[PDB]
Amino acid sequence: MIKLCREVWIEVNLDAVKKNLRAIRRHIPHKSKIMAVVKANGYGHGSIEVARHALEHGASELAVASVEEGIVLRKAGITAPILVLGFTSLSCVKKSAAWNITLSAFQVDWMKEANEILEKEASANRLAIHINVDTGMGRLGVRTKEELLEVVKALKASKFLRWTGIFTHFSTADEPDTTLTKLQHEKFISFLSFLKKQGIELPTVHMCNTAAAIAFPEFSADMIRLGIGLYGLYPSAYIKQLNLVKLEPALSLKARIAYVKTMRTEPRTVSYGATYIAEPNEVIATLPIGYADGYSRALSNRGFVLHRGKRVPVAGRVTMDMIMVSLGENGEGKQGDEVVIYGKQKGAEISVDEVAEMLNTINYEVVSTLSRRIPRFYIRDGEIFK
């Protein structure tokens, strides 16, 4: 089995991932391609192994949050295109060219200076660029028909840059009111008709995320960007109810009990503040996970774990590296038993959506804030490895 000094770990099921990608393949047009999104350390699942696997089973490009996230992928052996979705400083232009990482950009001045920087070094490859159009998200990108015409011309003269795409982003595609998503769509096809009547040919167009591809597959165009659905999680409860694609969750979290005792002597106080007093014959177990791992402190006298197919509550305040649970009056448990924090055990289950609702947040934040000091194990074909 699994041999650790501190006994807490994560398991990622790679057979779930490949299944999730087929379901999405068979929904969108045959003519469209898939860009796997693995930023923030693969949404907390580990970026290297999920990307490797995704590119074997349907995907052909990848997307990350920064140059540094992309360089980790090339050092692991990957030669596919890698797109950087945020903003990159002119200070990393030559190093992105060297590692062949694709960059987003949307200003005339940025393109002129990035061109001169590689001009003054010759001995270079050319730098590939996607243009970001802002149709309603308000974060990054260009916003008028004239501005965008200026940027396509500054890019077409620049001998060391090369134009490989143009995209946008919907801000409310997971919501049952489709008003603003459709208005974004026709703003975008507008700007592209203009560029065309000018005599300008187009590269790869992409605009959909998980929710958009499931709910508006006729917006697929050349490419889509698959993120949260790769990992078996739905963007919103609304999109799940539509019942159009069946996904399977890939992540679960576990530990082993560290100690078991009956509260006979006194005092019978438990954890900081002494917010919990046991009864003379209650049984209290101690487990090795805390808020510095990503288990929220606000779950103090409130959360659950699974022990032997049943839910036992958390007793007292959460601490930095450890929590206590109550097995009840004359409990039943041993040092060494296995406990489930997120996932399945026999019949019972505690899902990540259940925990996120209990904390007033979204499943996105619950997985991608899991500390890197927890070791990750991968299952593929029934067998474990790392």
Ligand X SMILES: Cc1ncc(COP(=O)(O)O)c(C=O)c1O
Residues 33-52 that bind ligand X (CB under 6 A): 37
- In the range 115-174, which residues lie near ligand X by CB under 6 A? 169
C-beta closer to a copy of itself: residue 32 or 236: 236
C-beta closer to a copy of itself: residue 180 or 195: 180
Handedness of CA 219, 225, 227, 230 (dihedral sign): positive
Reading the block at residue 221, the tokens are 């165009």
Q: Which does 6 bind (CB under 5 to 8 A by kind): a copy of itself, ligand X, Cl ion, none?
A: a copy of itself
Handedness of CA 77, 25, 229, 221 (dihedral sign): positive
- In the range 125-164, which residues lie near a copy of itself by CB under 8 A? 136-140, 143-144
Instruction: Provide, rounded to whole angstroms, the least separation between the CB of residue 169 and ligand X.
Output: 4
Q: Annotate each residue in 212-231 with x if it binds ligand X (CB under 6 A) or - if it does not, as one string.
A: -------------x-xx---
Tell me how crowded residue 142 is: count the other CB atoms within 10 A of its CB: 22
**Whole-angstrom distance, CA of residue 9 vs CA of residue 254:** 6
Q: Taking CA 87 as the corner, what is the angle to CA 211 and CA 85, rounded to the nearest 5 degrees?
A: 30
**Whole-angstrom distance, CA of residue 50 vs CA of residue 231:** 9
Q: Does 169 bind Cl ion (CB under 5 A)?
A: yes
Question: Could you tell me which residues are annotated as the binding site for substrate?
Answer: 139, 320
Clarify whether 43 is annotated catalytic.
no
Count residues near ligand X (CB under 6 A). 9
Chain breaks in the chain (C to N over 2.5 A) after: none
C-beta closer to a copy of itself: residue 184 or 252: 184
- In the range 201-240, which residues lie near a copy of itself by CB under 8 A? none
C-beta closer to a copy of itself: residue 221 or 370: 370
Clarify whether 276 is annotated catalytic.
no
**Whole-angstrom distance, CA of residue 5 vs CA of residue 337:** 15
Out of 235, 249, 316, 331, name the contact with ligand X by CB under 6 A.
Answer: 235
Reading the block at residue 253, the tokens are 């979290």
Reading the block at residue 193, the tokens are 């008709």
